[PDB]
JSON list of C-alpha atoms in Angstrom, two decimals:
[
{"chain": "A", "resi": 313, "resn": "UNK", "atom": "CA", "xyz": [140.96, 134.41, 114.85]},
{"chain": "A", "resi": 314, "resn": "UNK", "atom": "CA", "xyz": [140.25, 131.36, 116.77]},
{"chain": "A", "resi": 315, "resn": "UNK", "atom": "CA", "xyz": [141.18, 127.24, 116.27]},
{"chain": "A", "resi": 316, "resn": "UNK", "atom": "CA", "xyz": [138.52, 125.56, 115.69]},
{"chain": "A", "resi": 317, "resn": "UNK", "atom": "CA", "xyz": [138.08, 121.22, 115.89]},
{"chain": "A", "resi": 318, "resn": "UNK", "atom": "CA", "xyz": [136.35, 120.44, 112.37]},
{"chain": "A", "resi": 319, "resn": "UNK", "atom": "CA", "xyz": [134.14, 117.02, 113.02]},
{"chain": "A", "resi": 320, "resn": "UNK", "atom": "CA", "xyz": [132.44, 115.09, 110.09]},
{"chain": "A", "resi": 321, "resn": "UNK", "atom": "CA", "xyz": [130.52, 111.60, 110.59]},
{"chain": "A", "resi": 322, "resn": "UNK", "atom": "CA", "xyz": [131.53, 108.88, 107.75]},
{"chain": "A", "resi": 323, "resn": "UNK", "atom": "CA", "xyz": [129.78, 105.77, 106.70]},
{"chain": "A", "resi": 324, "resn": "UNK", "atom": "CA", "xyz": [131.83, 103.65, 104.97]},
{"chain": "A", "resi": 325, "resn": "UNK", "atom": "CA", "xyz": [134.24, 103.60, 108.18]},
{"chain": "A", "resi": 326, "resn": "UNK", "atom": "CA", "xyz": [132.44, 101.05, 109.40]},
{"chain": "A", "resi": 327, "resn": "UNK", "atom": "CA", "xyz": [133.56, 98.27, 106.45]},
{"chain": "A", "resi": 328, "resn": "UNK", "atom": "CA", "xyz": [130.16, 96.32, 107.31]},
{"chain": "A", "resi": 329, "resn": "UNK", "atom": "CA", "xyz": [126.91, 97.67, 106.25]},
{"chain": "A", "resi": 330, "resn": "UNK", "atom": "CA", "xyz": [125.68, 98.70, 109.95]},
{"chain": "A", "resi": 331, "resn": "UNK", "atom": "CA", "xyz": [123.77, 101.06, 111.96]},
{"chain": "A", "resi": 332, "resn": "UNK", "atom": "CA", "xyz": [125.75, 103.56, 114.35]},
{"chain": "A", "resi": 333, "resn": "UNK", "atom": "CA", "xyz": [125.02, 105.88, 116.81]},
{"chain": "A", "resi": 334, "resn": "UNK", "atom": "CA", "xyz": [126.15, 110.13, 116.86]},
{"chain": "A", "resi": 335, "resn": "UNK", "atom": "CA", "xyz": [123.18, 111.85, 118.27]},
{"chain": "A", "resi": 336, "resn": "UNK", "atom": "CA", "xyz": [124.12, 115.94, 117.75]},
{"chain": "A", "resi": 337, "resn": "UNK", "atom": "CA", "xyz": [123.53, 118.54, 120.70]},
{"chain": "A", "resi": 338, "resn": "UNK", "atom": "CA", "xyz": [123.29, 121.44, 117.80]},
{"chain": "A", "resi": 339, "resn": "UNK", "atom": "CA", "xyz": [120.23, 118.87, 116.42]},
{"chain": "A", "resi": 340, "resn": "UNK", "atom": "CA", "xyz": [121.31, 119.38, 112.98]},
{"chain": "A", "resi": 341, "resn": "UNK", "atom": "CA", "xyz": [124.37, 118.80, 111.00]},
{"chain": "A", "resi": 342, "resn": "UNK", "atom": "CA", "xyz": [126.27, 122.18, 108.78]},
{"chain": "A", "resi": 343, "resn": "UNK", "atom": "CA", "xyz": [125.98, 119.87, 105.99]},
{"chain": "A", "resi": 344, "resn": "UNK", "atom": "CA", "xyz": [125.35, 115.94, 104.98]},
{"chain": "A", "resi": 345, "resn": "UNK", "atom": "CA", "xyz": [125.42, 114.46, 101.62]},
{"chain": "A", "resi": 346, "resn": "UNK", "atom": "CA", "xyz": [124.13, 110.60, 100.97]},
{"chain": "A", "resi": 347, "resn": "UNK", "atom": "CA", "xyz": [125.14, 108.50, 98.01]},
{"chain": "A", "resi": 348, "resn": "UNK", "atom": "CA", "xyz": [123.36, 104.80, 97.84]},
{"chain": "A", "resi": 349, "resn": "UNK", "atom": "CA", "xyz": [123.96, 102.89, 94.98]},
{"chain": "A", "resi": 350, "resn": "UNK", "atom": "CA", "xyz": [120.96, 101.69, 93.38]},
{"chain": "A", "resi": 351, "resn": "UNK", "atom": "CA", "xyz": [122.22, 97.96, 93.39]},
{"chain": "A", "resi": 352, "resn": "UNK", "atom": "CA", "xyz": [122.57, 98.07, 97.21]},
{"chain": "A", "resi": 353, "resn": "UNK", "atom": "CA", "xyz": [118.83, 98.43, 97.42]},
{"chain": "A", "resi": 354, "resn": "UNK", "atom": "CA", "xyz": [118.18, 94.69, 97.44]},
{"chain": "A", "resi": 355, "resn": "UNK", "atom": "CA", "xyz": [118.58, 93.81, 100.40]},
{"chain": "A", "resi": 356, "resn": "UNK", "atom": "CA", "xyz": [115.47, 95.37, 101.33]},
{"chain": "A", "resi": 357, "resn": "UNK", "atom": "CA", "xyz": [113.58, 95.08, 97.86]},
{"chain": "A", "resi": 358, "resn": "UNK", "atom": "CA", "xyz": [114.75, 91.65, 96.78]},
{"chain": "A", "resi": 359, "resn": "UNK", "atom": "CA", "xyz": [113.09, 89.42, 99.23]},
{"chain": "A", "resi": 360, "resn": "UNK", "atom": "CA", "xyz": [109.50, 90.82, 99.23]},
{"chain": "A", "resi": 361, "resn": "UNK", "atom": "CA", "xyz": [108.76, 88.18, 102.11]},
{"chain": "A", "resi": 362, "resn": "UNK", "atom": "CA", "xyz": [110.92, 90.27, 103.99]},
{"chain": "A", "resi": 363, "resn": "UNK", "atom": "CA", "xyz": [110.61, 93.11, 106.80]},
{"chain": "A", "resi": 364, "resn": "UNK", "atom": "CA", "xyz": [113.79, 95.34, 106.55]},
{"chain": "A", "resi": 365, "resn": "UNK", "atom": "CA", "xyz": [112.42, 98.16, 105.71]},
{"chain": "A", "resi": 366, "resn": "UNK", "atom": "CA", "xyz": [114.73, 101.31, 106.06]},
{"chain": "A", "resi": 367, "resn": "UNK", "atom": "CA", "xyz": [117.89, 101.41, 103.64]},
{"chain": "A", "resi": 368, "resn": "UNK", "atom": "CA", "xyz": [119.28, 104.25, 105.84]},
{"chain": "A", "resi": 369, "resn": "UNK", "atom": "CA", "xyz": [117.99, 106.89, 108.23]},
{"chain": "A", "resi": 370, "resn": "UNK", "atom": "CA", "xyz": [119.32, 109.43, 110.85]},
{"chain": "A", "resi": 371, "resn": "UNK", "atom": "CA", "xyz": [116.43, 109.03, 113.33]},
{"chain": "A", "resi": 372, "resn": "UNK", "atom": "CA", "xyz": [115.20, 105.20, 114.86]},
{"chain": "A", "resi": 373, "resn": "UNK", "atom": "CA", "xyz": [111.99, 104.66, 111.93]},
{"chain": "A", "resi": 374, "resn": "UNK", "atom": "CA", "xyz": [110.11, 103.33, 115.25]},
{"chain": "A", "resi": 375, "resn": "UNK", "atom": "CA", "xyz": [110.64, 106.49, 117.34]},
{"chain": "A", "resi": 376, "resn": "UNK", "atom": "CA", "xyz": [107.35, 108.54, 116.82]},
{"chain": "A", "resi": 377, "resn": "UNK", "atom": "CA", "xyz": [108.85, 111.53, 116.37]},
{"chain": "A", "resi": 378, "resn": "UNK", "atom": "CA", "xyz": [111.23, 110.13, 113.30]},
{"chain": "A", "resi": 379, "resn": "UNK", "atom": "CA", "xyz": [108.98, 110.68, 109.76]},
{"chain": "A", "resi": 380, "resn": "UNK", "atom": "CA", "xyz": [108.71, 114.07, 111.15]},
{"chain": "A", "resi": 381, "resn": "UNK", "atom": "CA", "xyz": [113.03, 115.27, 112.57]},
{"chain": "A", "resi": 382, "resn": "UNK", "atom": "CA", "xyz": [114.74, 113.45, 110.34]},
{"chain": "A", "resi": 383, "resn": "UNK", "atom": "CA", "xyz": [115.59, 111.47, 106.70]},
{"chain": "A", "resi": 384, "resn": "UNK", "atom": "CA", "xyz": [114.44, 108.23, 105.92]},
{"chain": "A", "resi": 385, "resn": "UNK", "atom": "CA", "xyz": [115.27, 106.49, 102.96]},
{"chain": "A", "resi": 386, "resn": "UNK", "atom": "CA", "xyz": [113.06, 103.78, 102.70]},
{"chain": "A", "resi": 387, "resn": "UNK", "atom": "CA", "xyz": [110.70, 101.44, 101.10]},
{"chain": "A", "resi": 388, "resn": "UNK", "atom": "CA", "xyz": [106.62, 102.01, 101.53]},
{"chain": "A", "resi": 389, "resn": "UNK", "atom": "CA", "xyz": [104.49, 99.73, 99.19]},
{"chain": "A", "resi": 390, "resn": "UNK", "atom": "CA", "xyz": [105.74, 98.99, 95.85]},
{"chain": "A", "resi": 391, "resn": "UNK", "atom": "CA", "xyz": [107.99, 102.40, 95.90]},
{"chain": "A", "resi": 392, "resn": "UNK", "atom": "CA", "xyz": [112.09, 103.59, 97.86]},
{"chain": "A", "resi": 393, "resn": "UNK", "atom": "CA", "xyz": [111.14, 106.77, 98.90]},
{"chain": "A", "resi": 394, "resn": "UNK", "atom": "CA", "xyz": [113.22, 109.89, 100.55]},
{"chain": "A", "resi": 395, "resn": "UNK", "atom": "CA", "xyz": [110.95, 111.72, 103.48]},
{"chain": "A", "resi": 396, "resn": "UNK", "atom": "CA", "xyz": [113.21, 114.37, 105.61]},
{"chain": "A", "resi": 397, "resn": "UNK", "atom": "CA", "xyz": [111.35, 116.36, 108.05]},
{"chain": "A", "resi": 398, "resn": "UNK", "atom": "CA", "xyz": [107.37, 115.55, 107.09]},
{"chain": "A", "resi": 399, "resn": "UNK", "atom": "CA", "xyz": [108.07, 116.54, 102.78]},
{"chain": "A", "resi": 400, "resn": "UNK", "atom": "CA", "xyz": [109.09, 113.63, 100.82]},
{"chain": "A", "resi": 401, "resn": "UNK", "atom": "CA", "xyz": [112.05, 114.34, 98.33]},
{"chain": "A", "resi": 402, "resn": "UNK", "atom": "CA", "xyz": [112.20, 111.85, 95.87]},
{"chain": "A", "resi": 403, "resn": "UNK", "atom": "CA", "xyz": [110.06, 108.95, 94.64]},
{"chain": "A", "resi": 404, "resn": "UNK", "atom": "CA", "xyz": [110.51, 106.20, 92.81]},
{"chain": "A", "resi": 405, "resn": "UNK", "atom": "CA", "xyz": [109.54, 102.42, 91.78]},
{"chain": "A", "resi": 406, "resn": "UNK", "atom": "CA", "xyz": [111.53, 99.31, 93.58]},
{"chain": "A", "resi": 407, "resn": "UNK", "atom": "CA", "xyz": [111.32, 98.00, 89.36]},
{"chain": "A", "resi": 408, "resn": "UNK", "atom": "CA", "xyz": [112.94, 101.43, 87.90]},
{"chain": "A", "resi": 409, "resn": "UNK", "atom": "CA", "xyz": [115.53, 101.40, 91.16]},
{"chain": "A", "resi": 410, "resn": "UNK", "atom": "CA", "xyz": [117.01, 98.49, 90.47]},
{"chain": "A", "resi": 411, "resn": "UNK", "atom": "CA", "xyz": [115.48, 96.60, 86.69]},
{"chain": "A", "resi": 412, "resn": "UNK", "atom": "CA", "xyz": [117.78, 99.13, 84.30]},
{"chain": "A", "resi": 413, "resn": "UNK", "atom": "CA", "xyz": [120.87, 98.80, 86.27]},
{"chain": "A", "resi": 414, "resn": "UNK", "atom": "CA", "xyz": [122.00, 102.68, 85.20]},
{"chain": "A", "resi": 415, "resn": "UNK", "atom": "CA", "xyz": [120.91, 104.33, 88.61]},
{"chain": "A", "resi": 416, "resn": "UNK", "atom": "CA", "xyz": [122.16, 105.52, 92.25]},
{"chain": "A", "resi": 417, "resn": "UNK", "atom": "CA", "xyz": [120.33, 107.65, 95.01]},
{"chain": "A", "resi": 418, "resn": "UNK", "atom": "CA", "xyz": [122.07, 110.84, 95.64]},
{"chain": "A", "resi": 419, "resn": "UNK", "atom": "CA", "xyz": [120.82, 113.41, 98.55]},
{"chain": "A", "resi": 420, "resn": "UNK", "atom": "CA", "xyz": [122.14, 116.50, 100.36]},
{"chain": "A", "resi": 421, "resn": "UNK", "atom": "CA", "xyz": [120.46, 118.61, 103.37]},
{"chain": "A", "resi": 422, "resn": "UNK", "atom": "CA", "xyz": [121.33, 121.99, 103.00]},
{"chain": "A", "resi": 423, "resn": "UNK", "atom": "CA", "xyz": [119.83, 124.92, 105.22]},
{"chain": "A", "resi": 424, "resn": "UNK", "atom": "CA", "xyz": [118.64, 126.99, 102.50]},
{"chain": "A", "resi": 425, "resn": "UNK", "atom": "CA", "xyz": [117.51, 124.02, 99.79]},
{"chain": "A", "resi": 426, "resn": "UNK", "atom": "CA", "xyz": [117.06, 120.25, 100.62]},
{"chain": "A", "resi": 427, "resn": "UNK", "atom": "CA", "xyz": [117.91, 118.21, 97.52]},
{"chain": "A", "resi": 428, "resn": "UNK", "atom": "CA", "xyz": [117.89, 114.63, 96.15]},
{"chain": "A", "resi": 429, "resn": "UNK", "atom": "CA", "xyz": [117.59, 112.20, 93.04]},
{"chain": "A", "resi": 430, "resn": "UNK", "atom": "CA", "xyz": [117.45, 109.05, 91.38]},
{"chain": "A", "resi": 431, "resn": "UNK", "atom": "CA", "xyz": [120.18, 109.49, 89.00]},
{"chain": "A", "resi": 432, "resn": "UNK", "atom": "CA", "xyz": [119.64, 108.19, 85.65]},
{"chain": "A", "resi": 433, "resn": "UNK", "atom": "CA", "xyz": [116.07, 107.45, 86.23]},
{"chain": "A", "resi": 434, "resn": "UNK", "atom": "CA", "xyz": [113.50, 109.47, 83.81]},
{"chain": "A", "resi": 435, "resn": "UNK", "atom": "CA", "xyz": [109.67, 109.40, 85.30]},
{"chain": "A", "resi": 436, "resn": "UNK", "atom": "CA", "xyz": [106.70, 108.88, 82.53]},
{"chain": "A", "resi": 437, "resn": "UNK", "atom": "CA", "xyz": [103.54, 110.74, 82.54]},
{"chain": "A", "resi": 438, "resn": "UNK", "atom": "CA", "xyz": [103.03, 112.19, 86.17]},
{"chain": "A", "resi": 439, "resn": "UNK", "atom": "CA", "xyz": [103.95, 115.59, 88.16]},
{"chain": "A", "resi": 440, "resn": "UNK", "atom": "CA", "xyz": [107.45, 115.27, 86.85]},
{"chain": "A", "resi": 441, "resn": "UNK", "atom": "CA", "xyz": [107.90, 116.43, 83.72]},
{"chain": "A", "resi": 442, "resn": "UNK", "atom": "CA", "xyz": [108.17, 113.23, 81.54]},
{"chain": "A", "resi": 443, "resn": "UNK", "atom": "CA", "xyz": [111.71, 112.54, 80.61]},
{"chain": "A", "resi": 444, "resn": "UNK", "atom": "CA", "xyz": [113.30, 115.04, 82.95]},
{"chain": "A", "resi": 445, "resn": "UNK", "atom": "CA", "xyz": [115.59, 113.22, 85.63]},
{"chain": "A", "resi": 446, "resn": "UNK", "atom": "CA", "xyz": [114.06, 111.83, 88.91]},
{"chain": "A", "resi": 447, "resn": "UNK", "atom": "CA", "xyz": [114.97, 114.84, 91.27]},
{"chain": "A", "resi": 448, "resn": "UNK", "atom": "CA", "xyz": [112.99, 116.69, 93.96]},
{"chain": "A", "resi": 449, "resn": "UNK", "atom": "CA", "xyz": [114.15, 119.74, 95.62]},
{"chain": "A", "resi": 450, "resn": "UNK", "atom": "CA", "xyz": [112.44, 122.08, 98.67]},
{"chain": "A", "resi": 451, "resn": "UNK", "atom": "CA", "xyz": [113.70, 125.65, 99.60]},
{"chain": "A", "resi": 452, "resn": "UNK", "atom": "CA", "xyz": [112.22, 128.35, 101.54]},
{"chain": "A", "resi": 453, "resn": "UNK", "atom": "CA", "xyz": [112.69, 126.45, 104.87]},
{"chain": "A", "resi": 454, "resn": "UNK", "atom": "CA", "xyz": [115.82, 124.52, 106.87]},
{"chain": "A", "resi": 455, "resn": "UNK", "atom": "CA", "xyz": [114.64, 121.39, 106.13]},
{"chain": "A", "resi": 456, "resn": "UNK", "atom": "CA", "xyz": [118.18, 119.49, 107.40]},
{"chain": "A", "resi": 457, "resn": "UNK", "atom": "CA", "xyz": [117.44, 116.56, 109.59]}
]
């Protein structure tokens, strides 16, 4: 056996909602898990006049090589989507993220399945089964940003 130094990067260490730097050598982190509660989303969503436009990401969103390394959890048009590597997770409506007040983004990047949902959210007639939860999942790749 050997000792090992077990490291693990927090958010809410911070107190105020901020951006931080940890840039990995090993590119990729074992394991991360995101939880965003839906209510936090207006800061972004709530003025429409203005141009904050990531909610969180683990790559700059103007380094070119960003929509394609890493996850960003943002809003494009009238939607807050999840996008980690080039795929897109989850999708859904600025309205039906924050209008029924029952809802919070979770997301975790796992090397054998990359997984996240809108929580409480139920999408109509579309490529999600209507009435099944707002979730998107990939597998059969290491999608971990």
């Amino acid at each position: 056996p050997v000792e090992q130094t077990t490291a693990e990067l927090n958010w809410p260490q911070n107190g105020v909602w901020q951006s931080v730097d940890a840039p990995l050598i090993g590119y990729v982190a074992t394991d991360l898990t995101v939880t965003v509660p839906c209510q936090a989303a207006a800061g972004l969503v709530g003025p429409e006049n203005r141009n904050r436009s990531v909610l969180l990401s683990t790559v700059p969103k103007q380094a070119p090589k960003a929509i394609d390394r890493g996850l960003l959890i943002e809003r494009i048009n009238n939607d807050l989507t999840v996008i980690v590597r080039n795929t897109p997770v989850v999708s859904a409506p600025l309205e039906q993220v924050l209008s029924p007040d029952c809802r919070y983004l979770t997301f975790t990047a796992h090397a054998d399945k990359v997984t996240g949902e809108f929580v409480g959210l139920t999408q109509g007639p579309d490529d999600d089964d209507p009435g099944e939860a707002v979730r998107g999942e990939r597998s059969g790749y290491d999608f971990r940003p």
